[PDB]
């Protein structure tokens, strides 16, 4: 790893804030066994006054449960006039928790109940940050307001494994199902618009390319899979990602040809593989002893993976 | 070791104010570009960009 | 207890005389440097499983075909053919070999001559495994190639796992391992990249059939990990490494005077330029 | 003697070969004393102080040698 | 109890393996072979991670005789390998201070001098 930061406990999930918070540093959230930490990261590649990585814990939230997914709210700002931290979490208790903070003394959380199975993924699904989409082992995709009222529910054919909001198009939710189907839902009409099918199963994670909204990447079985819309429902590319089960797929936020994949946590060291579409092999192979969560920095060609009491950062040479 | 100022000679030679590019032969212009490339390689060895500016990863 | 039926199936008496070296190993008390007799019994099994693989190999040198390994036939036996047993790579026979390699845990705590004899031994065994994968890959026909290129990556990620294991070991055996899985691009090419010898990767491409099309696809795949102008100490003999790892038409103008090509790339760079006005 | 006492507080402060060198210098000084220095001058006060300084040096060198071995690793 | 502990042992989560194995001691009190195997596994992973105190604690909890001595030996080999000799000096040998001393001595005067800052 280019950089390494020590953590109090095991990192189960890690997510960079994909939004602009108005600070010079990039916000990072990571979930432990019973807590969520919010930190600021500054890198030597952004500021020549930083030697390597400046990592500052801003806030720690007691969760009481193992965090499985974290979603940032678009309303999240660190501006001194009206600081507002908002994020959602899913945990092993099948509940969603929305956290709100002013980075001072006001720390509130709301519990949302209604999933009957484990929640596998969640996102904010509105530009205004009012709505949360969640997917789980109850074979539902559910839409919630910040009041914890269910606005909508889509019945899935298998466990929902990943959910993502479309970066430019209003009302388009992507839902990846474990059996290899990726569906798109319109949240205005409450209808499925389209599906894609993976050649391999189980489908474990899918992400939108923010730089090219026609591209979707995923991991299914051992392979990474790319689709280009609207050209075909069939994959454009399908290549090996890992020797034993791929787990997470995330697109780089700065490059439309770069993405990271993670292997399944197990008896082998979890490998991170960074791929470039022009290359038949990974451009970088990292090892994390046991790691969960994968996120990309908003501006830098830098990705983070959580591990045993550590965050590991890889810079990719562009 | 003023390698950044070596590259500014390209801006001076290409300047329409003095039209210095009109007095160079094709062989001299090739030799100038080779010498500018040599100074640009020395900037890369100093961990600067090919033009002598700050590099951000 | 019997043998006639354990000869038709002797392959099983190798996956279990390993599980009985491990349950002997649990009682080897060989955690500290003081234990020794118990690191001598783990080697006595390593010698027998090894010379048993030596015997399968030499009985595949004693062929009868006048086309398959002509040496040993009506032609001179002074030069044996490929020392492979032409084994098909069993998924339990191979697993017990990749188990007893990871009994490189003893060479951590062991007297100096002993750590070398078991290292020459685990080298002698692995040079039968890489030989049987090579013989099986050679036999593959052109169609169904997708399965053939996936079996290649599987052997190449194991010659690549047999290498970090011998990165702590003696490199006097690296010359032999590199020649054993020979026509070796993956090993020798990553050895030329960890050092400052791109005089070696030039000497490798000088005497080769197609190693240029391999080194770019192999070096390009490994670019930024091995042979990187930033991983190597590129300023010394490592800038002598940087000279061939710098191997391209922009440079083409400097070394061949292709001004027209230089103009096209210089304009293309000028268009993508957003960061610096002066540039 | 004079320079040996200076080395005393210097050692006292909070490579392995360098530590061994200093020990050698101390021993050479002591052998010279056993021979050249008269029995009258041999009997002086700093002997016990010199021994404590030497024990501190041995302890720092041992740990220093271990640190050097770790760096070599 | 043996299974959940084995699952924790796989994925590589040694802290959760310790927590679950502690719960499993309450239920399967009669069982002692699976408990010995799981505690030996916890010891190994703590030792591999360099968690010397937790590895020592795990070794003292092993049901089968003398596995504590096994935790004590591999330990000195790797501590001397990590050239982390100061910690080893600070860590007084648990009860048998003279056992450790002598076992160490033995292995040491039995090997060579061209591979051992062990005398060091």
UniProtKB/Swiss-Prot annotation, chain D:
Disulfide bonds: none
Source organism, top-level taxon: Eukaryota
Compartments it resides in: Nucleus, Nuclear pore complex; Nucleus membrane
Sequence similarity: Belongs to the nucleoporin Nup85 family.
Quaternary structure (record): Component of the nuclear pore complex (NPC).
Known function: Component of the nuclear pore complex (NPC) that seems to be required for NPC assembly and maintenance. Involved in nephrogenesis.
Record protein name field: Nuclear pore complex protein Nup85
Organism: Xenopus laevis
Gene name of the record: nup85
Full protein segment contained here: 573 to 649 of 653
């Amino acid at each position: 790893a280019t950089y390494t930061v020590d953590c109090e406990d095991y990192v189960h999930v890690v997510e960079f804030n994909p939004f602009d918070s108005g600070e010079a540093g990039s916000l990072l959230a990571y979930g432990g066994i019973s807590y969520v930490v919010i930190a600021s990261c500054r890198f030597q590649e952004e500021d020549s006054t930083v030697e390597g990585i400046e990592f500052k814990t801003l806030k720690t939230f007691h969760h009481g449960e193992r965090v499985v997914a974290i979603a940032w709210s678009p309303e999240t700002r660190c501006d001194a006039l009206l600081p507002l931290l908002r994020f959602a979490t899913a945990a092993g208790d099948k509940k969603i928790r929305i956290f709100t903070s002013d980075f001072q003394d006001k720390n509130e959380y709301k519990v949302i109940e209604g999933h009957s199975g484990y929640i596998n993924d969640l996102v904010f699904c509105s530009p205004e940050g009012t709505d949360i989409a969640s997917v789980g082992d109850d074979h539902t995709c559910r839409i919630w307001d910040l009041d914890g009222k269910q606005i909508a529910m889509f019945i899935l054919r298998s466990p929902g494994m990943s959910v993502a909001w479309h970066p430019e198009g209003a009302f388009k939710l992507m839902v990846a199902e474990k059996t290899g189907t990726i569906r798109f839902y319109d949240l205005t009409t409450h209808q499925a618009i389209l599906s894609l099918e993976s050649v391999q199963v189980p489908l474990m994670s899918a992400d939108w390319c923010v730089r090219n909204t026609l591209r979707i990447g995923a991991v299914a079985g051992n392979d990474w899979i790319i689709w280009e819309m609207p050209r075909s429902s069939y994959p454009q590319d399908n290549k090996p990602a890992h020797a034993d089960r791929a787990r997470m797929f995330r697109w780089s936020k700065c490059n439309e040809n770069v993405f990271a994949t993670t292997g399944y946590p197990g008896k082998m060291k979890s490998q991170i593989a960074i791929h470039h579409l022009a290359h038949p092999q990974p451009i970088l192979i990292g090892t994390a002893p046991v790691g969960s969560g994968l996120s990309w920095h908003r501006r830098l060609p830098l990705c983070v993976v959580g591990g045993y009491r550590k965050l590991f950062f890889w810079l990719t040479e562009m | 070791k003023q390698y950044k100022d070596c590259l500014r000679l390209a801006d001076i030679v290409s300047s329409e104010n003095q039209k210095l590019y009109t007095v160079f032969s094709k062989t001299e212009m090739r030799n100038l570009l080779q010498k500018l490339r040599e100074s640009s390689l020395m900037l890369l060895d100093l961990q600067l960009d090919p033009l002598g500016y700050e590099i951000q990863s | 207890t019997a043998a006639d039926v354990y000869f038709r199936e002797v392959s099983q008496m190798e996956i279990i005389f390993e599980c009985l070296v491990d349950k002997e190993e649990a009682d080897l008390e060989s955690t500290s440097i003081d234990s020794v007799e118990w690191a001598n019994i783990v080697v006595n099994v390593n010698t027998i499983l090894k010379d048993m693989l030596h015997v399968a190999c030499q009985y595949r040198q004693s062929k009868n075909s006048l086309y398959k390994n002509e040496s040993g036939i009506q032609e001179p036996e002074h030069v044996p053919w490929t020392a492979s047993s032409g084994t098909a790579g069993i998924r339990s026979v191979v697993t017990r070999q990749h188990g007893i390699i990871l009994k490189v845990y003893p060479q951590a705590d062991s007297g100096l001559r002993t750590i070398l004899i078991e290292q020459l031994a685990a080298l002698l065994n692995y040079l039968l495994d890489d030989y049987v994968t090579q013989l099986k890959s050679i036999d593959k026909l052109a169609n169904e190639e997708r399965y053939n290129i996936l079996e290649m990556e599987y052997a190449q990620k194991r010659s690549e796992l047999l290498s970090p294991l011998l990165i702590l070991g003696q490199y006097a055996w690296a010359s032999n391992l590199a020649e054993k899985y020979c026509d070796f691009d993956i090993l020798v090419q990553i050895c030329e990249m960890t050092d400052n010898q791109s005089r070696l990767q030039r000497y490798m491409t000088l005497f080769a059939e197609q190693n240029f099309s391999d080194f770019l696809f192999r070096w390009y795949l490994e670019k930024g990990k091995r042979g990187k102008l930033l991983s190597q100490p590129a300023s010394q003999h490592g800038q002598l490494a940087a000279f061939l790892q710098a191997h391209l038409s922009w440079l083409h103008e400097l070394n061949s005077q292709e001004f027209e090509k230089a103009h096209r790339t210089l304009q293309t760079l000028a268009n993508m330029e957003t960061r610096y006005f002066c540039k | 003697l004079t320079l040996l006492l200076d080395a005393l507080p210097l050692l006292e402060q909070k490579s392995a070969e360098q530590t061994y060198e200093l020990m050698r210098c101390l021993e050479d000084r002591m052998a010279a004393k056993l021979e050249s220095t008269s029995p009258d001058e041999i009997q002086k006060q700093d002997s016990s102080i010199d021994n404590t300084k030497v024990e501190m040096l041995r302890l720092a060198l041992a740990r220093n040698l271990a640190r050097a071995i770790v760096t070599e690793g | 109890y043996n299974r959940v502990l084995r699952l924790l042992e796989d994925v590589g989560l040694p802290e959760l393996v310790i927590q679950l194995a502690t719960i499993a001691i309450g239920e399967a009190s009669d069982d002692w072979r699976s408990q010995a195997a799981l505690r030996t596994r916890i010891f190994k992973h703590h030792l591999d991670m360099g968690h010397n105190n937790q590895a020592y604690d795990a070794l003292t909890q092993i049901p089968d005789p003398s596995r504590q001595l096994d935790c004590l030996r591999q330990l000195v080999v790797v501590l001397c390998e990590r050239s982390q000799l100061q910690d080893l000096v600070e860590f007084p040998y648990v009860n048998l201070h003279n056992e450790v001393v002598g076992i160490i001595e033995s292995r040491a005067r039995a090997v060579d001098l061209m591979t051992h800052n062990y005398y060091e």
